[PDB]
Design a protein around this ligand. Structure first.
Ligand SMILES: *[C@@H]1O[C@H](CO)[C@@H](O[C@@H]2O[C@H](CO)[C@@H](O[C@@H]3O[C@H](CO[C@H]4O[C@H](CO)[C@@H](O)[C@H](O[C@H]5O[C@H](CO)[C@@H](O)[C@H](O)[C@@H]5O)[C@@H]4O)[C@@H](O)[C@H](O[C@H]4O[C@H](CO)[C@@H](O)[C@H](O)[C@@H]4O)[C@@H]3O)[C@H](O)[C@H]2NC(C)=O)[C@H](O)[C@H]1NC(C)=O
Ligand SMILES: CCCCCCCC/C=C/CCCCCCCC(=O)O[C@H](COC(=O)CCCCCCCCCCCCCCC)COP(=O)(O)OC[C@@H](O)CO
Ligand SMILES: CCCCCCCC/C=C\CCCCCCCC(=O)O[C@H](COC(=O)CCCCCCCCCCCCCCC)COP(=O)(O)OC[C@@H](O)CO
Ligand SMILES: CCCCCCCC(=O)OC[C@H](COP(=O)(O)O[C@@H]1[C@H](O)[C@H](O)[C@@H](OP(=O)(O)O)[C@H](OP(=O)(O)O)[C@H]1O)OC(=O)CCCCCCC
Ligand SMILES: CCCCCCCCCCCC(=O)OC[C@H](COP(=O)([O-])O)OC(=O)CCCCCCCCCCC
Ligand SMILES: CCCCCCCCCCCC(=O)OC[C@H](COP(=O)([O-])O)OC(=O)CCCCCCCCCCC
Ligand SMILES: CCCCCCCC/C=C\CCCCCCCC(=O)OC[C@H](O)CO
Ligand SMILES: CCCCCCCCCCCCCCCC(=O)O
Ligand SMILES: CCCCCCCCCCCCCCCC(=O)O
Ligand SMILES: CCCCCCCCCCCCCCCC
Ligand SMILES: CCCCCCCCCCCCCCCC
Ligand SMILES: CCCCCCCCCC
Ligand SMILES: CCCCCCCCCC
Ligand SMILES: CCCCCCCCCC
Ligand SMILES: CCCCCCCCCC
Ligand SMILES: CCCCCCCCCC
Ligand SMILES: CCCCCCCCCC
Ligand SMILES: CCCCCCCCCC
Ligand SMILES: CCCCCC
Ligand SMILES: CCCCCC
Ligand SMILES: CCCCCC
Ligand SMILES: CCCCCC
Ligand SMILES: [Cl-]
Lengths: 135, 170, 121, 199, 51
C-alpha cells in the first residue's frame, strides 16, 4: 500500500550558481501517454518541478528537480501472497470439522498448513530488498 | 563438456540481396549432445520413483493411508523433477524427448495410484452389495488377484515402454 | 459496460469539431480512430492516433482534417476543415489495439453510436 | 518541411523478412503492416514511418507446463471420492496435497510474466481449479462429519438394510460428487476454452 | 538432494565423487524402504501388542 515520490535532479557539474543558472519554462515537464509506460507495479499520479541551491566544496550550484509520484498497484501481490495465505488459514480451519479421533489426519493438516505458511512468507519477500523492518 | 563435435564443414557460395550479390563463406559444426549428465540428472530418478511406485502393490488393500501416501509422494516427486527441469530451459512450444519420458513416468505412477483407488472402491463398494446378492486380465471380484496382476504387469509394461522409447530415440 | 460518447455539430453551410470521450475503460493505451460511413457505403478510415502521439490520415482527408488526443481526459477530437457537400455522412469513433489493421474497421473492438454531419451550399 | 521519408517500393513490399531467419520461440509472426504519418511535438512536425509486426503467442508450452498439471491435480483431488469414508488420513492426504500442489502451481505460473497488476486467463483457470480442489476437500470434510463409526467394513459381515455389529453406509455425498465434480469440471473446461480460443 | 547437487557445476558427462556418494546414499534409502516392504509382507496380524 506504499506510495513514493521519486526524484530526478540535474545541475551544472562545473559552473557554480554565479556562472550558470537554470530555470524552468512555463510548461517544462510534459508527458504523453502516462499509463502506456512500462510501469507494471506502479501507477503515475502526477509530477512537480522545483529548484534549489545546493552548497558543495566547489561552490553553490542551482539544482533543478522533477518529482514523479507513483502509487503501487495491489493486483500482483494480492494474487501472489494475500489470497494463498488466507486460503491456507481456511485450510487450517478445516481441521476443526474433522473428527478428533483422526489424529494423523488433523496433525498432518496442521503441520502442513504451518509449512505452507513458512514457504509463503519466504517467497513473499523475494520482490523486496533485504530491509530490516516489518512491512 | 556437454557436446561432441561430430564434424565440421566449409562452404563457399553467393548470396543475393536487393542491393546485389555478395560472397559468402560458411563454417558449420555438427554437435552431438552427451547423455550422461541427463542420465544422472533426470532419467534415473524418474525410473527409480516409478519403480518405488510399485511397492504399493505388495501392501494390503486395508493400508489405505500408507498406499495413498506412497502414491501421492511418487506423483509429487515426479512433479518436482519436471519443475526443476523446466526451470533451466527456454519456453519452446513443443514436447521434447525428455518431456515424453517424464510424461510417461507420470502416467505410470498415476495409474499405480489409480490401481489402489480401484481396489479400494471395488472392495468397500461392491463387497457389501455382492454379499447381499449372494496375459489375460484378472477377475474383477478378487482384490488380491488385481494386486498380483498389477505386480506382474506394471514392471513389464514399464520395461516395454522404456524399450520402445530408447529404441526410437537412439 | 464500455462506451464511447460522441458529440459535435450536425448541420453546416465550413469548420466543425467532433469530440469522442471514452468511459468505463482506459483507452489511452489503445489506438483511437475516426471512420466515416455514408449510406450505401462501407466504413472507411479517416484518421487515427497511436499511444505515441503519432497521427495517421487517409489520402482523401490528408491535410484537411486533424486528429488530436487528450490522454488525461481519455478523449479523441477531430477538427474538420474545408467541409464540402460530398463530405456529408455518419462519423464513427473507434478504439482498439491495431492487430492486422490500423486502417481496417475489423481491428477495432470498440465503437461509438455515431454522429450525422451535413453540409448545405 | 526539411526532411520527408518515403518507402522505396510500395509500403507492403518495402519491408521484407527473410524466410530462413526467425528467432521467435513462443511466438508466430503472422505478418507486417506498413504505414506512415506525422508526429507533432514542441519542436515541430516530424514524419514518422511505422511497421507493425503482428505476433500470436504459442500456447503449447503453457499447456504442457501449467494447464495439464492443474487438470491432473483436479482429477487427483476428485479421485478421493471413490475411497471409503473411513479412510480419513488417506482422504485428508489427498485433499491437503492437492491443495498445496495447486498453490505451488499458482505461485510458479506467474513467474513467466512481468508482474502485471491484473488477472490473466491462466490466473482465472488456476483460480477455478483451486476452487474445485478446495471444494473437494470441503466435501470430504462433510463426509467425515456425517460419518458415525470409526471402523470400515470388515469384509465378511452383511450390511443389513437401513430402511450385532452395524457398519457405515456409503455416503450419498460421495455418490453424488463422483458424477457432479467431473461433469462440472468438464463443463468449465468447455466454456473456458470456447471463450478464450476463438478470439 | 541429487537434483540440486550439481547446480553450480558444468554439465560434464561423467560421474564425480559427489555423484557416487549421492548414489550410494540413495541406494541405502531405497533398500531401507524395500526392507520395510519385505517386513510388512510377512506381518500376519493387523494389530500391535497391547500393553
Ligand atoms: C549444417 O547445416 C547447413 C544448413 O543446411 C548445411 O549447409 C549447406 O551445405 C551444403 C553442402 O554441405 C551446401 O551446398 C553446397 O554448395 C556448394 C557450393 O555451391 C556454390 O558454388 C557452386 C560452384 O560455383 C555453384 O554452382 C553453387 O550454386 C547453385 O548451384 C547448385 C548446382 O547447380 C545448385 O543446386 C544450388 O542451388 C546452388 O545454389 C553455389 O553457389 C556445392 O559445391 C555443393 O555441391 C555438392 O553437390 C553437387 C551436386 O550437384 C556437386 O556437383 C558438387 O561438386 C558438390 O559435391 C553443395 O551444393 C549448401 O549451400 C549449404 N547451405 C547453406 C545455407 O549454407 C551444412 O552443410 C551443414 N553442415 C554440417 C557440418 O552439418
Ligand atoms: C506433471 C504434468 C503431467 C501431465 C502429463 C499427462 C499425460 C497426458 C497429457 C498429454 C499432453 C500432450 C501434449 C500435447 C501438446 C499440447 C497441445 C498443443 O499445444 O497442440 C496444439 C493445440 O492446442 C490447443 O488446442 C490449446 C488448448 C488445449 C487444451 C487441452 C486441455 C483439455 C482439458 C480437457 C478437460 C478434461 C476434464 C476431465 C475431468 C474429468 C496444436 O495446435 P497448433 O499446432 O496449431 O499450435 C498453435 C499454437 O498455439 C502452439 O500449439
Ligand atoms: C547399468 C545401468 C544402466 C545405466 C546405463 C546408462 C548409460 O548408458 O550411460 C552411458 C554412460 O553415461 C555416463 O557415463 C554417466 C554415468 C552413468 C551412470 C549410470 C547409473 C549409475 C551412456 O553411454 P554412451 O556411450 O552413449 O555415452 C557417451 C556420451 O553420450 C556421454 O554421455
Ligand atoms: C459447505 C457446507 C455444505 C454443507 C452441506 C450439508 C449436506 C448434508 O447435510 O448432508 C446430509 C446427508 C448426507 O448424507 P450421508 O451419506 O452422510 O447420510 C448419512 C450417512 O450415510 C450415515 O452413514 C448414515 O448412518 P449409518 O451409516 O447407517 O450408520 C445416516 O443414516 P441415518 O442416521 O439417517 O439412519 C445417513 O443420514 O444427506 C444427504 O445425502 C444430502 C447430501 C447433499 C450433498 C449435495 C452435494 C452437492
Ligand atoms: C468430462 C467428462 C465428465 C463425465 C461425467 C461422468 C464422470 C465419471 C463418473 C462415472 C461414474 C460411473 O459411471 O460409475 C460406473 C461404476 C459405478 O457406477 P454403476 O453404474 O456401476 O452404478 O464404476 C465403474 O465401473 C468404474 C469405477 C472406477 C473407480 C476407480 C477409479 C477412479 C477414477 C477417478 C476419475 C476422476
Ligand atoms: C475463483 C474461482 C471460482 C470458481 C467457481 C466455479 C465457476 C468457475 C467459472 C467462473 C469463476 C471464474 O473465476 O471464472 C474464470 C473464467 C472467467 O474469467 P473472466 O473472463 O470473467 O475474467 O472462467 C472462464 O473463462 C469460463 C468459466 C466457465 C463458467 C461456466 C461453466 C461452469 C461449470 C461448473 C463449475 C462449477
Ligand atoms: C489465484 C488467482 C486469483 C484470480 C483473481 C484475482 C486477482 C485480483 C486482481 C485485481 C484485484 C484489484 C485490486 C484493487 O482493486 O486495488 C486497487 C489497486 O490500486 C490496484 O489493484
Ligand atoms: C472453515 C470452513 C471449513 C469447511 C468445513 C465444512 C464442514 C461441513 C460440515 C457441515 C455440517 C453441518 C451440520 C448441520 C446438519 C443439519 O442440517 O442439521
Ligand atoms: C519393485 C520392488 C517391489 C517390492 C517387492 C517386495 C517383496 C517383499 C516380499 C518378499 C517375498 C519373499 C519371497 C516369497 C515368500 C513366500 O511367498 O513364502
Ligand atoms: C511428436 C508428437 C507430438 C506429441 C503428441 C502427444 C504426446 C503424448 C505422449 C504421452 C505418452 C504418455 C503415455 C506413455 C505410455 C504409457
Ligand atoms: C546411449 C544409450 C543410452 C541408454 C540409456 C538407458 C537408460 C535406461 C536403462 C535402464 C532402464 C530399465 C527400465 C526397467 C524398468 C523395470
Ligand atoms: C520380488 C518378487 C517376489 C516374488 C514372490 C513370489 C510370489 C509369492 C506369493 C506368496
Ligand atoms: C529393459 C530394457 C531397458 C531399455 C534398453 C534400451 C537400450 C537401447 C539401446 C542401447
Ligand atoms: C514419438 C514418441 C514415442 C515415445 C515412445 C512411447 C512408447 C509408448 C509405448 C506404450
Ligand atoms: C476472486 C478471488 C478468487 C480467489 C481464488 C479462488 C479461491 C476459491 C476458494 C473456494
Ligand atoms: C470434457 C470436455 C473437454 C473440453 C475440452 C475442449 C478443448 C478444445 C480445444 C480446441
Ligand atoms: C539417484 C541416481 C543413482 C541411483 C544409484 C542406484 C540406486 C539403486 C537403488 C536400489
Ligand atoms: C528394485 C529392487 C527390488 C528388490 C526386491 C528384493 C525382494 C527379494 C525377495 C526375495
Ligand atoms: C479404472 C482404473 C484402472 C487403473 C488401472 C489398474
Ligand atoms: C520388479 C519385480 C517384479 C516381481 C514380479 C513377481
Ligand atoms: C466448483 C465446486 C463445485 C461443487 C459441486 C458440488
Ligand atoms: C461447496 C462444496 C460443497 C461440497 C459438497 C457438499
Ligand atoms: Cl520468442
Amino acid at each position: 500500500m506504499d506510495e513514493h515520490s521519486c526524484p530526478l535532479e540535474f545541475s551544472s557539474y562545473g559552473y557554480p550558481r554565479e556562472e550558470i543558472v537554470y530555470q524552468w519554462k512555463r510548461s517544462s515537464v510534459e508527458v504523453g501517454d502516462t499509463r502506456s509506460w512500462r510501469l507494471y507495479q506502479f501507477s503515475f499520479v502526477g509530477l512537480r518541478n522545483t529548484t534549489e541551491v545546493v552548497k558543495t566544496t566547489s561552490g553553490d550550484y542551482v539544482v533543478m528537480s522533477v518529482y514523479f509520484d507513483l502509487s503501487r498497484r495491489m493486483g500482483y501481490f494480492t494474487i501472489q501472497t494475500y489470497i494463498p495465505c488466507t486460503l491456507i488459514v481456511v485450510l487450517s480451519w478445516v481441521s476443526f470439522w474433522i473428527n478428533k479421533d483422526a489424529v494423523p489426519a488433523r496433525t498432518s493438516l496442521g503441520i502442513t498448513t504451518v509449512l505452507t505458511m513458512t514457504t509463503l512468507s519466504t517467497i513473499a519477500r523475494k520482490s523486496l530488498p533485504k530491509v530490516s523492518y516489518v512491512t | 563438456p556437454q557436446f561432441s563435435i561430430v564434424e565440421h564443414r566449409l562452404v563457399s557460395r553467393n548470396v543475393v540481396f536487393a542491393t546485389g550479390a555478395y560472397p559468402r563463406l560458411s563454417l558449420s559444426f555438427r554437435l552431438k549432445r552427451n547423455i550422461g549428465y541427463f542420465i544422472l540428472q533426470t532419467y534415473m530418478p524418474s525410473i527409480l520413483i516409478t519403480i518405488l511406485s510399485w511397492v504399493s502393490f505388495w501392501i494390503n488393500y486395508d493400508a489405505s493411508a500408507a498406499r495413498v501416501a506412497l502414491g501421492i509422494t511418487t506423483v509429487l516427486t515426479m512433479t518436482t523433477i519436471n519443475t526443476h527441469l523446466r526451470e533451466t530451459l527456454p519456453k519452446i512450444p513443443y514436447v521434447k524427448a525428455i518431456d515424453m519420458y517424464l510424461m510417461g513416468c507420470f502416467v505410470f505412477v498415476f495409474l499405480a495410484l489409480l490401481e489402489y483407488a480401484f481396489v479400494n472402491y471395488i472392495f468397500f463398494g461392491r463387497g457389501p452389495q455382492r454379499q447381499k446378492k449372494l496375459i489375460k486380465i484378472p477377475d474383477l471380484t478378487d482384490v488380491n488377484a488385481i494386486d498380483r496382476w498389477s505386480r506382474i504387469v506394471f514392471p513389464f509394461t514399464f520395461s516395454l515402454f522404456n524399450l520402445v522409447y530408447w529404441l526410437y530415440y537412439v | 459496460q464500455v462506451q464511447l460518447q460522441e458529440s459535435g455539430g450536425g448541420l453546416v453551410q465550413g469548420s466543425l469539431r467532433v469530440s469522442c470521450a471514452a468511459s468505463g475503460r482506459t483507452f489511452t493505451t489503445y489506438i483511437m480512430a475516426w471512420f466515416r460511413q455514408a449510406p450505401g457505403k462501407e466504413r472507411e478510415f479517416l484518421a487515427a492516433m497511436d499511444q505515441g502521439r503519432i497521427q495517421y490520415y487517409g489520402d482523401s482527408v490528408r491535410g484537411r482534417f486533424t486528429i488530436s488526443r487528450d490522454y488525461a481526459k481519455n478523449s479523441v477530437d477531430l477538427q474538420l476543415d474545408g467541409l464540402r457537400p460530398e463530405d456529408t455522412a455518419v462519423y464513427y469513433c473507434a478504439a482498439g489495439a491495431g492487430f492486422w489493421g490500423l486502417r481496417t474497421a475489423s481491428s477495432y473492438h470498440y465503437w461509438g453510436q455515431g454522429t450525422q454531419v451535413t453540409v448545405s451550399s | 518541411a526539411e526532411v520527408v521519408y518515403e518507402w522505396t517500393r510500395e509500403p507492403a513490399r518495402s519491408v521484407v523478412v527473410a524466410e530462413d531467419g526467425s528467432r521467435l520461440n513462443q511466438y508466430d509472426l503472422l505478418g507486417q503492416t506498413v504505414d506512415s504519418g506525422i508526429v507533432q511535438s514542441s519542436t515541430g512536425e516530424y514524419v514518422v514511418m511505422t511497421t507493425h509486426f503482428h505476433l500470436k503467442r504459442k500456447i503449447g508450452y503453457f499447456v504442457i507446463q501449467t494447464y495439464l498439471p492443474c487438470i491432473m491435480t483436479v482429477i487427483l483431488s476428485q479421485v478421493s471420492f471413490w475411497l471409503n469414508r473411513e479412510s480419513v488420513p488417506a482422504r485428508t492426504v489427498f485433499g491437503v496435497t492437492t491443495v498445496l500442489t495447486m498453490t505451488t502451481l499458482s505461485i510458479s505460473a506467474r513467474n513467466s510474466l512481468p508482474k502485471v497488476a491484473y488477472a490473466t486467463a491462466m490466473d482465472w483457470f488456476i483460480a477455478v481449479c483451486y476452487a474445485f480442489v478446495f471444494s473437494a476437500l470441503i466435501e470430504f470434510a462433510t463426509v467425515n462429519y456425517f460419518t458415525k463409526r470409526g471402523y470400515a467394513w470388515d469384509g465378511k459381515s452383511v450390511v443389513p438394510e437401513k430402511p450385532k455389529k452395524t457398519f457405515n453406509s456409503v455416503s450419498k455425498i460421495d455418490r453424488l460428487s463422483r458424477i457432479a465434480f467431473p461433469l462440472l469440471f468438464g463443463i468449465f473446461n468447455l466454456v473456458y476454452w470456447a471463450t478464450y480460443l476463438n478470439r
